From a paper:
In this work, we determined the cryo-EM structure of S-D614G and revealed the high degree of conformational heterogeneity mostly confined within the RBDs. Multiple substates within the one RBD-up or two RBD-up conformational space were determined. Collectively, 62% of the total population of S-D614G had one RBD in an up conformation (one RBD-up), including three distinct substates that separated the RBD conformations, and 38% of the population had two RBDs in an up conformation (two RBD-up) with two different substates. The three distinct RBD-up substrates in the one RBD-up class showed a 39 to 52° upward rotation with respect to the hinge defined as the Cα atom of the beginning of RBD, i.e., residue 330. Contrary to S-D614, we did not observe any all RBD-down conformation in S-D614G, in line with the previous study of a similar construct without the transmembrane domain, but differs from the full-length S-D614G that exhibits significant amount of closed, all RBD-down conformation. Compared with the wild-type S (hereafter S-D614), the increased propensity of S-D614G in the RBD-up conformation implicated the facilitation of the binding to the receptor ACE2. However, our cryo-EM structure of S-D614G showed no appreciable structural difference in the proximity of the mutation site with respect to some of the extremities of the reported S-D614 structures, including the first reported structures of S-D614 (4, 5), the acid-stabilized form of S-D614 (22), the disulfide- and proline-stabilized HexPro-S variant, and the furin-cleaved S-D614 that adopts a more open conformation. Meanwhile, Benton et al. proposed that the loss of a key salt bridge formed by D614 of one protomer and K584 or the other protomer due to the D614G mutation leads to local disorder, thereby increasing the dynamics of S-D614G and more populated RBD-up conformations, a finding that could be confirmed by our cryo-EM structures. We argue that the increased stability of S-D614G could be further attributed to the increased configurational entropy manifested in the higher conformational heterogeneity of the RBDs, which contributes to the free energy gain of the system.
The SARS-CoV-2 S protein (hereafter S protein) is responsible for host recognition and viral entry. The S protein binds to the receptor, angiotensin converting enzyme 2 (ACE2), through an upward open RBD conformation (RBD-up); a downward closed RBD conformation (RBD-down) sequesters its receptor-binding motif (RBM) from receptor binding, rendering such a conformation inactive. The D614G mutation in the spike protein of SARS-CoV-2 alters the fitness of the virus, leading to the dominant form observed in the COVID-19 pandemic. Here we demonstrated by cryo-electron microscopy that the D614G mutation resulted in increased propensity of multiple receptor-binding domains (RBDs) in an upward conformation poised for host receptor binding.
Numbering used by the authors:
A (entry chain A): 298 to 621, 635 to 676, 689 to 741
B (entry chain B): 742 to 828, 854 to 1037
C (entry chain B): 27 to 69, 80 to 143, 159 to 173, 186 to 245, 264 to 297
D (entry chain C): 742 to 790
E (entry chain A): 988 to 1037
Write the structure that this text describes.
C-alpha cells in the first residue's frame, strides 16, 4: 500500500499515510407510528346490495391507512387485474383521495370495463375515461344474486344515440319517444322504456351470472397526501453500527441511552448544523442518543526498504479494542493517539527518531525489531552552584558549520488559450 | 462529500486527483506546525536542575521556579495563565500535538535554571557556574553603568525587583483581557471550522440538501445532475476553507519565527 | 380603543429540541410594540379581515367566549370552519353552515349540507391563541397560563406551543367570535426576523427582534 | 451580484453564507491597515517643540 | 451539444488552473521571505562581525 501511494519502488525511513478505514454497518432497523386507523373497506366489498349499472353507487374515501396486500392474495375474486399501476407497489404510494364505484354486471360484460372499448354498457351506462383509472375488481355473486336476488331488481339502460361522457350518471327515467319526424313519422308511438331487466336463471351459465364489480380511481398529486399504505416495523439493537429510519429521518450511527428530557411535543433534537443527536421513537416513547460510527486514517512506520522489509501499523484516534492478519496481530500498544501494532514496548527512553505523537516515538535505536518508547528531551545533569565559586575555561577550539538557504526557484509561464 | 453512497463516489472519481492535493496541503501545514514548535522551544542539549538550596544574594524567584507540589510541576504564573484563557462528526479529525505540555514545562524550566545559574555562557559551549551578584555586575557593565553602582545599592534593587514581580502577579490575577491574541486565534479557528461544517446543510440550488432523499425520490436521469450540483458546491466551499487555512498558517509561521528570534537573542544573552 | 403589545406573541416555530443555542429564525411573527384593536363587547362582535393568520386574546375565565367561525362567504355556498366547546371537549368541523346574525353559544347550528370532516379533542387567567395557515395546514396554538408581572395589563414574556394541526386545505378570509344569549385583543402577523434564546431544558426564555432598533 | 432585485436576492441567499466571510475578511484587512499605520507612526507619548 | 461539452471542459480546466496559480503565489511569497532572510544574513555576517 505504501508503494502504491508513493508510486515508487523504494521508500525512505519515516511515517506515511496509506488510506482510511471505516466500520462497516449491520442489519437495518425501521420504526413507525404505533397505531394505524383501519379504513372501513369491510362495508364496501361485503356490502348488502349493489345498485343497477345505470344507477351505480359512489363513495369518496380518504384519511385512511389500508393494506392492499392483504386483499390481493384473496382468491375470492373472479378477476383482479389493474391498469398502469403495479398492485405489489400499492403499499408504497400516497394519494389525495380514492373514489369507489360499486355495481353488478352480467357474466359476459367483464370485457366492457376497460379504456378505449366498445359496448353497450361501455359507452351508454358507464364510460371509463381515456386515461388511467385505478383498477377494476370483479367477483362472482351467484350465491347471493342468481339464487335469492331480485328477478328484475337489476337493470340496465337500453338508451342509445346519447353516448355518455366519462363519469356521468343519467338516472332520469324518461320514456324514449322522439315525437318528431324520424320515428315512423308519428308522435307518441315507438315509445320504449329506457331501462330493461337482466335475464338470469339458477345456474344459467357463465355469461349470464351476475358479478359484483367495484372500480377504484385514485387521485394523485392533486392535493397533499391524505391516504397512504401501512409500513411494517421491527425491533432495535444497542451498541452496534446500524442504519436506521425512526419515522423518516434516516441515518447511520450507534444507539445509546440518553438522559435528555424532551418536552411533550418535540420530535428530535440537535446541536448545530442539522446534526441530529437525540431521537425518540413512537412505540416506546423513549429518548435515545446517536453517536457517529468510528473511522479514521491509518499510517505505516517503516525504517526504509533498503534496510529491511518490516513495518508497524498505527491506527489513529480509535479505541483499539475493536479494530476489525491485523485483526489480532502482535502486541497491541494503545497510546494517547490511537493504537500501534507490530512493535514492542519498553520502559527505557532514548533519542527520538520517527515522531509519532503524544510524546512517544518508535524506531530501532537506543534485535531486528521495531520498538516504541517515550522520547527523552536529552541528557541530565546538575551544576553545583555556590555563592563563592567560579569556573574559567583554559583551552579553546574553532569549528566550522554549514547552513543552506534557498533564494530562488524555477520561472515558468503557462499559455492560456493553447492549454 | 458522499457520506457512503455508491453513485456519489462513482460521479466523484471522474473529477481528477484534487483530494491528493488537499491532503498533501493539510499534511504539509501540520508538519510545519510541529517543526515550528520544535524549533522555537528545543534550544538546549541538556536539562539542568536547580540546586536544593536557594540564596540568590537577596532575590526571591519562588514564584517563577517550578513547584513540585502541583502534579504538572508548573509555577504560579503558568497556572494563572492556563486558568485565565479558555476555549468528529462527518469526516473531520484533530490530531494531537507531538510535544505535550509536560515536556514544554521541562524545557522552560531548563532554560530558566540555565539562565539563572550560568548566565549567557550556557549558550556558547558548556555551562559554567557563576554567582548571581557577579552576573548582574556584568549586565550593568554592559549598558554603560559602571559596576560600582550595583554593589553599593544591592538591597534597594532586591526590594524593587520583588515589589515589581508582586505587582505584575497582582495585575495578571486581577485584570483580565490581557491575553487577546491567543483568544482571537482560537476563536478564528473555531469559527472557520464551524462555518465550514455549517455550509453542509445549504440547498445549493438542488431539490433538497439531503442526498439520500434526493436519490430515493427521483430516477437517475436528473439525479446525476442534482448530485453534480451538490458535489461542485461542496468542493468549492472546501477549497475556500483550505485557502484560508494556508494564509493563516503562513501568518502564524512568520509570527513564530519572530518569537524564536526574540527568545534566542534576549534570553540567552544581552540585547 | 387601541392598545400596545409589549412583548406578547412568540412561539415555537418547529419541533426540534435545542439547548443553549442562540438561534436566528426568519418566520412571520407579531412585531414588538405593535398596535392591537381592543374591543369592549360588554354592556358587539364586528367582522374582521383574516390577512394570513391572526393573534387573539381574552381575560374572562368563564363560559362566554366560546366559538370561532371562519370562512370567506359565511353561507352554505362555501365550507365554514367551527371551533366550539361543551365544557368537556372540542369539536372541529369543516362542514357548511348558513349565515348567523346573532348566534348564541355557551354551556348557530343552521345546516349540514356537504359535511365532510369531523374531529374531537380535549388577576384572572388569560387564554392566548394564534391562528396560522401555511400551504393547506391550519395551525392553532394556545396558552392557558397567566403572568402577574403588572396589574390590569398583560406585560411580560411567554411562549406558545402547538396543539392542533389540521391538513384541511381551504382558504379563509373572514372570521368572527361567538358569544351567548343574554373584551379581547386582535393583532396581525408580519414576516419579521427574530433571535431566540433556549434554556437548558429547551424552553424559550428570551426573544429579541432583528428589525426594530439599531441596538437590536 | 444582484443590484436591487427581489428574486435575485432569493437565489443568492440559497447558496449559503459566502458574503459573511467575504465582508469579515475585508473588514479584517481594513482594521489591520489602521493598526499598522498607528503602530509604525505613533511611537511617542508627548509632543516636543 | 458540442458547445455544452466544450463548456464543461473549459470550466473544469479553468478551475484547475486557478488552483495551481494560487498555490504558486503562496509558494513564491514564502520563498521571497526566505530569500530576504538570507540576504540579511549575508550582508551582516560576511561583510562584518556579528
Ligand atoms: C368480507 O368478510 C370476509 C370474512 O370475514 C373477509 O375475509 C377474511 O375472513 C377472515 C376470517 O373471517 C378474517 O380473519 C379476515 O380479516 C378477513 N379479511 C379481511 C381483509 O379482513 C373479507 O376480507 C371481507 N371483505 C372485505 C373486508 O372487503
Ligand atoms: C405501542 O404499542 C405496543 C404494542 O401494542 C404497546 O406495548 C404494550 O403495552 C401494554 C400496555 O399495558 C403492555 O402490557 C404490553 O406488554 C406492551 N407490549 C410490548 C410488546 O411492549 C405500547 O403500550 C404502545 N404504546 C403507545 C404509546 O401506544
Ligand atoms: C475503550 O472502551 C472501554 C470500554 O469497553 C474502556 O474501558 C473503560 O475502563 C475504565 C477503567 O477500568 C472504566 O472505568 C470504564 O468504565 C470503561 N469503559 C466503559 C464504557 O465501561 C476503555 O477505557 C476505552 N479505551 C480508551 C482508550 O478510551
Ligand atoms: C568544582 O567543584 C564542584 C564541587 O566540589 C564539583 O561538583 C561535583 O564534583 C564532583 C567531582 O568528584 C562530582 O562527583 C559531583 O557530581 C559534582 N556535583 C555536581 C552537583 O555536579 C565540580 O565538578 C567541580 N568542577 C570541576 C571542573 O572539577
Ligand atoms: C588545547 O587542545 C588541543 C587539542 O584540542 C591541544 O593540542 C594537542 O596537544 C596534544 C599534547 O601535546 C597533542 O598530542 C595533540 O596532537 C594536540 N592537538 C592538536 C590539534 O594540536 C592543546 O595542547 C590544548 N592546550 C592546552 C593549553 O591544554
Ligand atoms: C518569596 O515570595 C513568595 C511569594 O510566593 C513568598 O511566599 C509567601 O510568603 C508570605 C509571607 O509569609 C505568605 O503570606 C504567602 O502565603 C507565601 N506564598 C506562598 C505561595 O507560599 C516567600 O515567603 C518569599 N520568600 C522570600 C525569601 O522572600
Ligand atoms: C428543567 O427540568 C428539571 C426537571 O424536569 C426541573 O427541575 C429542577 O432540576 C434541577 C437540575 O437537576 C434541580 O437542581 C432542581 O432542584 C429541580 N427543581 C425541581 C422543582 O425539581 C428544572 O426546574 C427545569 N428548569 C431548569 C432551568 O433546570
Ligand atoms: C542502505 O543504508 C545504508 C546505511 O544507511 C547505506 O550505507 C547504504 O548505502 C544504503 N543502500 C542503498 C542502496 O541506498
Ligand atoms: C515497565 O515497568 C512496569 C513496572 O515494573 C511493568 O509493569 C511494565 O511491564 C514494564 N514495561 C515493559 C514494556 O516491560
Ligand atoms: C396606534 O398607532 C397610533 C399611530 O398610528 C398611535 O398614535 C397610537 O397610540 C397607537 N395605539 C396604541 C399604542 O395603543
Ligand atoms: C355538545 O353537547 C352535545 C350534547 O350531548 C354533545 O353531543 C357534544 O359532544 C358536545 N360537544 C362536543 C364538542 O363534544
Ligand atoms: C356538494 O359538493 C359537491 C362538490 O363535490 C357539489 O357537486 C354539490 O353540488 C354540493 N352539494 C350542494 C347541495 O351544494
Ligand atoms: C385559495 O383561495 C382561492 C380564492 O382566491 C380559492 O379559489 C382556492 O380554492 C383556495 N385554495 C384552497 C386550497 O382552498
Amino acid at each position: 500500500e505504501t508503494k502504491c501511494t508513493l508510486k515508487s519502488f523504494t521508500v525512505e525511513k519515516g511515517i506515511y499515510q496509506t488510506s482510511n478505514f471505516r466500520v462497516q454497518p449491520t442489519e437495518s432497523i425501521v420504526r413507525f407510528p404505533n397505531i394505524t386507523n383501519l379504513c372501513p373497506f369491510g362495508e364496501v366489498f361485503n356490502a348488502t346490495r349493489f345498485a343497477s349499472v345505470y344507477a351505480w353507487n359512489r363513495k369518496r374515501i380518504s384519511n385512511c391507512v389500508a393494506d392492499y396486500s392483504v386483499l390481493y392474495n384473496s382468491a375470492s375474486f373472479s378477476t383482479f387485474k389493474c391498469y398502469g399501476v403495479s398492485p405489489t407497489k400499492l403499499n408504497d404510494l400516497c394519494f389525495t383521495n380514492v373514489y369507489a364505484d360499486s355495481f353488478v354486471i352480467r357474466g359476459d360484460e367483464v370485457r366492457q370495463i376497460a379504456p378505449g372499448q366498445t359496448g353497450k354498457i361501455a359507452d351508454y351506462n358507464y364510460k371509463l375515461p381515456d386515461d388511467f383509472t385505478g383498477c377494476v375488481i370483479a367477483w362472482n355473486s351467484n350465491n347471493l344474486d342468481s339464487k335469492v336476488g331480485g328477478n328484475y331488481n337489476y337493470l340496465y339502460r337500453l338508451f342509445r344515440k346519447s353516448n355518455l361522457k366519462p363519469f356521468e350518471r343519467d338516472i332520469s327515467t324518461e320514456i324514449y319517444q322522439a315525437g318528431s319526424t324520424p320515428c315512423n313519422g308519428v308522435e307518441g308511438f315507438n315509445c320504449y322504456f329506457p331501462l330493461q331487466s337482466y335475464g338470469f336463471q339458477p345456474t344459467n351459465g357463465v355469461g349470464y351470472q351476475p358479478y359484483r364489480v367495484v372500480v377504484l380511481s385514485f387521485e394523485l398529486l392533486h392535493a397533499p397526501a391524505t391516504v397512504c399504505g401501512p409500513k411494517k416495523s421491527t425491533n432495535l439493537v444497542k451498541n452496534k453500527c446500524v442504519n436506521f429510519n425512526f419515522n423518516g429521518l434516516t441515518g447511520t450511527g450507534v444507539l445509546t441511552e440518553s438522559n435528555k428530557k424532551f418536552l411533550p411535543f418535540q420530535q428530535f433534537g440537535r446541536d448545530i448544523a442539522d446534526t441530529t443527536d437525540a431521537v425518540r421513537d413512537p412505540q416506546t416513547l423513549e429518548i435515545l442518543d446517536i453517536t457517529p460510527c468510528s473511522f479514521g486514517g491509518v499510517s505505516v512506520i517503516t525504517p526504509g526498504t533498503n534496510t529491511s522489509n518490516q513495518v508497524a501499523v498505527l491506527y489513529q484516534g480509535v479505541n483499539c479494542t475493536e479494530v476489525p492478519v491485523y485483526s489480532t496481530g502482535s502486541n497491541v500498544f494503545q497510546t494517547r493517539a490511537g493504537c500501534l501494532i507490530g512493535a514492542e514496548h519498553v520502559n527505557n527512553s532514548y533519542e527520538c527518531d520517527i515522531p509519532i505523537g503524544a510524546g512517544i516515538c518508535a524506531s530501532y535505536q537506543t534485535s531486528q525489531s521495531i520498538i516504541a518508547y517515550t522520547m527523552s528531551l536529552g541528557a541530565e545533569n546538575s551544576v553545583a552552584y555556590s555563592n563563592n565559586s567560579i569556573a574559567i575555561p583554559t583551552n579553546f577550539t574553532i569549528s566550522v558549520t554549514t547552513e543552506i538557504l534557498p533564494v530562488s526557484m524555477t520561472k515558468t509561464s503557462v499559455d492560456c488559450t493553447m492549454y | 462529500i458522499c457520506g457512503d453512497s455508491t453513485e456519489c463516489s462513482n460521479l466523484l472519481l471522474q473529477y481528477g486527483s484534487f483530494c491528493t492535493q488537499l491532503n498533501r496541503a493539510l499534511t504539509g501545514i501540520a508538519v510545519e506546525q510541529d517543526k515550528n514548535t520544535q524549533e522555537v522551544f528545543a534550544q538546549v542539549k541538556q536539562i539542568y536542575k536547580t540546586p536544593p538550596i536557594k540564596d540568590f544574594g537577596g532575590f526571591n524567584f519562588s514564584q517563577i521556579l517550578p513547584d513540585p507540589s502541583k502534579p504538572s510541576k508548573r509555577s504560579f504564573i503558568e497556572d494563572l495563565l492556563f486558568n485565565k484563557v479558555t476555549l468528529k462528526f462527518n469526516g473531520l479529525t484533530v490530531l494531537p500535538p507531538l510535544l505535550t505540555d509536560e515536556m514544554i514545562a521541562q524545557y522552560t524550566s531548563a532554560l530558566l535554571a540555565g539562565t539563572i545559574t550560568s548566565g549567557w555562557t550556557f549558550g556558547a559551549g558548556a555551562a559554567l557556574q557563576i554567582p548571581f551578584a557577579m552576573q548582574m555586575a556584568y549586565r550593568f557593565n554592559g549598558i554603560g553603568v559602571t559596576q560600582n553602582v550595583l554593589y553599593e545599592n544591592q538591597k534597594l534593587i532586591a526590594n524593587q525587583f520583588n515589589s515589581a514581580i508582586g505587582k505584575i502577579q497582582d495585575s495578571l490575577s486581577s485584570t483580565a483581557s490581557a491575553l487577546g491574541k491567543l483568544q482571537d486565534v482560537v476563536n478564528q479557528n473555531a469559527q472557520a471550522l464551524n462555518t465550514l461544517v455549517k455550509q453542509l446543510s445549504s440547498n445549493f440550488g438542488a431539490i433538497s440538501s439531503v442526498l439520500n432523499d434526493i436519490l430515493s425520490r427521483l430516477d437517475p436521469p436528473e439525479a446525476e445532475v442534482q448530485i453534480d450540483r451538490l458535489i461542485t458546491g461542496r468542493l468549492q466551499s472546501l477549497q475556500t476553507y483550505v485557502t484560508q487555512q494556508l494564509i493563516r498558517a503562513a501568518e502564524i509561521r512568520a509570527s513564530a519565527n519572530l518569537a524564536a528570534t526574540k527568545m534566542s537573542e534576549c534570553v540567552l544573552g544581552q540585547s | 380603543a387601541y392598545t400596545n403589545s409589549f412583548t406578547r406573541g412568540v412561539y415555537y416555530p418547529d419541533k426540534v429540541f435545542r439547548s443553549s443555542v442562540l438561534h436566528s429564525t426568519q418566520d412571520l411573527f407579531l412585531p414588538f410594540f405593535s398596535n392591537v384593536t381592543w374591543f369592549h363587547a360588554i354592556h358587539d362582535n364586528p367582522v374582521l379581515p383574516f390577512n394570513d393568520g391572526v393573534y387573539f386574546a381574552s381575560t374572562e375565565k368563564s363560559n362566554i367566549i366560546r366559538g370561532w367561525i371562519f370562512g370567506t362567504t359565511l353561507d352554505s355556498k362555501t365550507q365554514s370552519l367551527l371551533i366550539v366547546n361543551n365544557a368537556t371537549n372540542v369539536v372541529i368541523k369543516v362542514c357548511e353552515f348558513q349565515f348567523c346574525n346573532d348566534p348564541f353559544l355557551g354551556v348557530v347550528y343552521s345546516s349540514a349540507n356537504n359535511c365532510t370532516f369531523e374531529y374531537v379533542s380535549q388577576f384572572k387567567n388569560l387564554r392566548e391563541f394564534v391562528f396560522k395557515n401555511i400551504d393547506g395546514y391550519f395551525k392553532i396554538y394556545s396558552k392557558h397560563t397567566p403572568i402577574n408581572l403588572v396589574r390590569d395589563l398583560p406585560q411580560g414574556f411567554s411562549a406558545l406551543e402547538p396543539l392542533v394541526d389540521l391538513p384541511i386545505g381551504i382558504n379563509i378570509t373572514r372570521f368572527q367570535t361567538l358569544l351567548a344569549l343574554h373584551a379581547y385583543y386582535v393583532g396581525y402577523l408580519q414576516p419579521r426576523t427574530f433571535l431566540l434564546k433556549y434554556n437548558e431544558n429547551g424552553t424559550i426564555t428570551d426573544a429579541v427582534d432583528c428589525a426594530l432598533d439599531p441596538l437590536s
